[PDB]
C-alpha cells in the first residue's frame, strides 16, 4: 500500500524530469511535500508549482525547468546530529558545490547549509542535485 507520500512525489518528479516533461501532477499532497518543494524551488530547481484543492488530500502541479538531476528521499528518517551531517553529505551528494540534504529540524524544514547556519540537527528527508 501507499506509505511515504514524499517518496512517491519525488519518484514521480524524478521520472517526469528524466523524460523531459514540462509539468508533473503529483498526488496526494502533504505539508511535508509542500515544504520540500518550497526548499527545492527557492534554490531554483523546479520553477513554480500550484496546489489543486479537493476535499481530500490535494494534488500539486509542478512546472519543471530542466536543472534537476536527481531528487531523492531517505527512508527511514534517520536522526542526524550536527557533526554526522558532514558524513551524510559525503555519502549523498557526489559533488561539493551543488546538492541538498533536506532536514526536518525543530526550526522547520530546510537545507543542510541553513541547518548548519542555525546550528541544529534533526531528521533527514531527502537530497537533490
Amino acid at each position: 500500500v501507499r506509505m511515504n507520500v514524499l517518496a512517491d512525489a519525488l519518484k514521480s518528479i524524478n521520472n517526469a524530469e528524466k523524460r523531459g516533461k514540462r509539468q508533473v501532477l503529483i498526488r496526494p499532497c502533504s505539508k511535508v511535500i509542500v515544504r520540500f518543494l518550497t526548499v527545492m524551488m527557492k534554490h531554483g530547481y523546479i520553477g513554480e508549482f500550484e496546489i489543486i484543492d479537493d476535499h481530500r488530500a490535494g494534488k500539486i502541479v509542478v512546472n519543471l525547468t530542466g536543472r534537476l538531476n536527481k531528487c531523492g528521499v531517505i527512508s527511514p528518517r534517520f536522526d542526524v546530529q550536527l557533526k554526522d551531517l558532514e558524513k551524510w553529505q559525503n555519502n549523498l551528494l557526489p559533488s561539493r558545490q551543488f546538492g541538498f540534504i533536506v532536514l526536518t529540524t525543530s526550526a522547520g524544514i530546510m537545507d543542510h547549509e541553513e541547518a548548519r547556519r542555525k546550528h541544529t540537527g534533526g531528521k533527514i528527508l531527502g537530497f537533490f542535485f
Binding site: 538531476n69 557526489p94 559533488s95 558545490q97 551543488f98
Partner: peptide, 30 residues
C-alpha cells in the same frame, strides 16, 4: 562487446564531465 570495467569507467568519467559542466555553468552566472 566490451568488458564492464571500462563501461563503468566511461559512465563515471562522463558523469564527472557532466558535473564539471554544470559547476562551470553555475559559476559563469555570477
Amino acid at each position: 562487446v566490451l568488458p564492464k570495467k571500462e563501461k563503468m569507467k566511461l559512465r563515471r568519467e562522463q558523469w564527472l564531465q557532466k558535473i564539471e559542466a554544470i559547476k562551470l555553468a553555475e559559476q559563469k552566472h555570477r
